[PDB]
Design a protein around this ligand. Structure first.
Ligand SMILES: [Mg+2]
Ligand SMILES: [Mg+2]
Ligand SMILES: [Mg+2]
Ligand SMILES: [Mg+2]
Ligand SMILES: [Mg+2]
Ligand SMILES: [Mg+2]
Ligand SMILES: [Mg+2]
Ligand SMILES: [Mg+2]
Ligand SMILES: [Zn+2]
Lengths: 196, 129, 157, 80, 150
RNA sequence: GGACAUACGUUUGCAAACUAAAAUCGGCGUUCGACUUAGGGAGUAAACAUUUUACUGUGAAAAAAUUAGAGUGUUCCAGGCAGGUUUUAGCCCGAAUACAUUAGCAUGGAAUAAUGGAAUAGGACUAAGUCCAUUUUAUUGGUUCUUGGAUUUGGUAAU
RNA sequence: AAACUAUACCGACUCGGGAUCGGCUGGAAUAAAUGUCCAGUCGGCACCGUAUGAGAAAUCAAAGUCUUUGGGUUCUGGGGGAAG
């Protein structure tokens, strides 16, 4: 539907499927009705995960308007499950973040809130992708020359949902951001006082 | 309290190479601490290094090759016209062969030497040899 | 009756119109001396529709402004249309290769037009000697807030 | 010889709260089930006060430096 | 470690890594905001309110859940504790000292202790006044303290 | 240094570099070509990026002195002269340059450092309405209107 | 006042080791003790061993990370006697 979009002009074959696909789920499943009623879309981008295997395995990332970001996270799990079943493609939800300029300030009486800065915006997606579960440890490495590798620590109990998307994420990030992102699984680090 | 963590981090590190530590954990870290680090790294003094995300202000771990002889900062970071250079080169560096007096410019941070290339330099930051 | 007499014994303008204006009984008679020192400076709205007779003003008189232009914080509001601005700069010390703090005090004349307040940044121009100290007139005033001591306040403005 | 980036779990489990890398607390949260009403209330591992069961009004926990002793036989799961 | 050339250590408290709200808990920011302001109305310190929400209703870190710091929540809802805990309390004991001193006009260790405590209060005033978070004409002398006693 | 990538600017005028359409011209509606409007880089100049510090760079910092180029004052101090009559009623060549910190001016700037912008609220951008002020319209009125400022409202923005 | 550690305060680092005083967390035996022990660990006197680190040395885990001379700040000295 052009309904579930903000620009409301024209959609792309991908964006279109996503629209009806969404409208589908709120009619089909009674539970996602409430949440999906709310959800609006900003834009959707498709990315090809090209591996040396000459295999074409694509997935698509969808930009949920910030207004519905709360809601999007509220049912995030179930939503992505159905969208992947109903589109046979890998699905990722992000927030539509607007980045502010560093030196291009123009409104004398306007300060650039850190909330919308490049470090913080680009760092956002990573949380968004692995979505269902947020990371435990994040790190940076400086290869001699000057590369920066982000080996990120992911929870063990989530090996399911995250192991698969794992390659897509890497590839979407390298495209949007510019950051190489390798992951590493570590058993969760429960630190409490076991007391028998 | 604390001040010029670049100094905090720097000596903690020297104490490392000097004691023969195999690697170092620098507690309070900043952009500066890191830039300086990749400048030493780039010139080949320190080895690979990792920045852990302390949700407050990151902690860094630097591998120790074994070539660092000394790396400190300089008290107030005086200003230094390009004309003020030899003064400091003969002053801080152990020779006219290990030129590494890091400075801050408007053109960022350059090696004692690079500043002559870019032709500007400005305030002193630290040194390593 | 107020702005005119108010103690002093008379207050006209540089352009002695007035009483004669009663000759042009139709158009606009209420003329006041109008000017524009220029130099990238706006002429105060308040300056125009005022009743004030300040000969020492840079918009209501044949008082020029030339060369030296200043920006400094204000110290005192006392004195009749005169204020003291304090500038805060650093001085270098050849030997120790460092600086010390220092402050010059300046006698500034204030045309009624702009409204003062203590502890605000002000912009002065270089006007001819108006008195022993005075040699600067206010041209642009910026209001600012300092919670307390003006002396404590030291800014490399 | 030890790696400072991939430190042993035990080691870090011994160290002092603030000495561990990522640095996390020891405190935890627990669902307590009264010895009567049964009501399940959440209580913090380091309660700084006496706690009553909002159902009846029984006594569940006594405050101490750090630990919170649980009154009599009440149930407790460690939510995590 | 404040006014102490010799004594110094580490009390505790280290916010866990994971910046999100605990799993087990469900509470629209609003839900909490009610408890917070309700609790506050009863006459509570944002300092104490947060304690309850942790000990009682398993809410470790209201800030992490709302995206709002307690005192802010409170100020937005008119339920703002006039004078900050900081100053308030210092002045409280600062006062308690004075009362005790009276009947013990000879207790010197206490004269001293008060000197330190009154010293601090002048340090907060300097601060809280500079953040236009307290009228400039504020002055703790003996009347500012007894003024709050009424 | 460009460009592009949610990414250091916007307007102007110039120049412009290529492309998408429409026109005209030729051959046989189209294959193609030359020539027009639109389009930004790039290419300059003015207006903007909170305010300084600090650094670049040039304008200014008298001469003599110090450094220093040329130059066999018999070497030299040092002067600034001198070199070739074999074009000799004339020829050749010189009197250079640098340093000058501290404060002022022009100006390039991304680091550190300080300073500042939207938190009572209000801000921002935008449209309309209303009120005050106002340039050119010969001039004076009255309307309107351009241009500043004041508010109210509604829209937009991850307020 | 030999008001003495004759050794300014704040801060970061770097050797080994047990024993302490205060608090905390796990555990074991008895027992079910405001006790005992084992193991951690913050914070506090102090000691033991040792330094291809410091010094004139006595000695110093800091009197160390200062010719490889620069974390922040306060106070003090400049041959002796006459003299505090
Ligand atoms: Mg200061
Ligand atoms: Mg401490
Ligand atoms: Mg651009
Ligand atoms: Mg025990
Ligand atoms: Mg023990
Ligand atoms: Mg010595
Ligand atoms: Mg010893
Ligand atoms: Mg020294
Ligand atoms: Zn009960």
């Amino acid at each position: 539907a052009l309904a579930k979009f903000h620009k409301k002009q024209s959609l792309t074959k991908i964006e279109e499927q996503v629209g009806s696909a969404l409208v589908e789920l709120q009619n089909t499943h009674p539970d996602l009705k409430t949440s999906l009623e709310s959800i609006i879309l900003t834009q959707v981008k498709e990315f090809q995960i090209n591996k040396t295997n000459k295999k074409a395995k694509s997935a698509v990332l969808i930009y949920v308007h910030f207004q519905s970001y709360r809601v999007l996270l509220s049912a995030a799990r179930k939503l992505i499950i159905e969208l992947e079943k109903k589109l046979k493609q890998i699905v990722f939800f992000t927030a539509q973040r607007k980045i502010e300029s560093k030196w291009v300030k123009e409104h004398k009486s306007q300060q650039r809130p850190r909330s919308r800065c490049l470090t913080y915006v680009y760092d956002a997606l990573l949380d968004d992708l692995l979505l269902p579960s947020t990371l435990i440890g994040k790190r940076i490495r400086a290869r001699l020359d000057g590369t920066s590798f982000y080996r990120i620590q992911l929870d063990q109990n989530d090996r399911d949902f995250l192991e698969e998307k794992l390659d897509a994420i890497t590839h979407i990030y390298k495209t949007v951001t510019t950051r190489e992102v390798t992951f590493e699984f570590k058993e969760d680090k429960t630190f409490h006082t076991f007391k028998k | 309290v604390k001040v010029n963590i670049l100094a905090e981090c720097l000596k903690d590190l020297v104490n490392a190479e000097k004691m023969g530590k195999k690697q170092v954990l620098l507690r309070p870290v900043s952009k500066v601490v890191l830039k300086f680090l990749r400048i030493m790294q780039k010139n080949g003094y320190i080895g690979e290094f990792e920045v852990i995300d302390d949700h407050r202000s990151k902690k860094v771990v630097v591998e120790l090759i074994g070539r660092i002889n000394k790396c400190g900062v300089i008290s107030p970071r005086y200003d230094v016209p390009l004309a003020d250079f030899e003064k400091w080169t003969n002053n801080i560096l152990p020779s006219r062969q290990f030129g590494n007096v890091v400075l801050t410019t408007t053109y960022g941070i350059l090696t004692h030497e690079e500043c002559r290339k870019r032709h500007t330099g400005g305030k002193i930051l630290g040194f390593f040899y | 009756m107020d702005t005119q007499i108010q103690r002093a014994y008379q207050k006209q303008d540089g352009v002695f119109l007035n009483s004669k204006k009663l000759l042009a009984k139709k158009t606009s008679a209420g003329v006041r001396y109008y000017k524009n020192i220029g130099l990238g400076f706006k002429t105060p709205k308040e300056a125009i529709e005022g009743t004030y007779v300040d000969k020492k003003c840079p918009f209501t008189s044949n008082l020029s402004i030339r060369g030296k232009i200043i920006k400094g914080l204000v110290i005192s509001t006392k004195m009749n249309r005169t204020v003291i601005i304090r500038r805060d700069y650093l001085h270098y010390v050849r030997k120790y290769n460092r600086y010390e703090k220092r402050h010059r005090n300046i006698p500034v004349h204030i045309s009624p037009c702009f409204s003062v307040k203590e502890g605000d940044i002000l912009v002065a121009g270089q006007c001819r000697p108006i008195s022993k100290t005075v040699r600067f007139n206010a041209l642009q005033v910026v209001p600012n807030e300092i919670i307390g001591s003006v002396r404590k306040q030291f800014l490399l403005f | 010889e030890r790696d400072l980036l991939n430190p042993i779990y035990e080691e870090e489990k011994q160290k002092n709260k603030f000495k561990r890398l990522i640095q996390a607390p020891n405190s935890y949260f627990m669902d307590v089930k009264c010895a009567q009403c049964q009501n399940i209330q959440m209580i913090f591992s380091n309660a700084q006060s006496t706690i009553i069961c909002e159902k009846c009004s029984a006594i569940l926990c006594k405050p101490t430096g750090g630990k919170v002793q649980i009154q009599a036989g009440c149930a407790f799961k460690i939510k995590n | 470690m404040q006014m102490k050339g010799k004594g110094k250590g580490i009390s505790g408290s280290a916010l866990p890594f994971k910046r999100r709200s605990p799993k087990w808990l469900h509470m629209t920011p609003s839900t909490v905001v009610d408890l917070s302001v309700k609790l506050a109305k009863k006459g509570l310190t944002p300092s104490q309110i947060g304690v309850i929400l942790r000990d009682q209703h398993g809410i470790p870190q209201v800030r992490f859940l709302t995206g709002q710091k307690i005192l802010r929540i409170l100020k937005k809802n008119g339920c703002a504790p006039q004078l900050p805990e900081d100053l308030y309390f210092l002045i409280k004991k600062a006062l308690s000292i004075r009362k005790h001193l009276e009947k013990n006009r000879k207790d010197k260790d206490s004269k001293y202790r008060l000197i330190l405590v009154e010293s601090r209060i002048h340090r907060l005033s300097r601060y809280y006044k500079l953040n236009q978070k307290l009228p400039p004409k504020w002055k703790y002398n003996a009347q500012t303290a007894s003024a709050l006693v009424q």
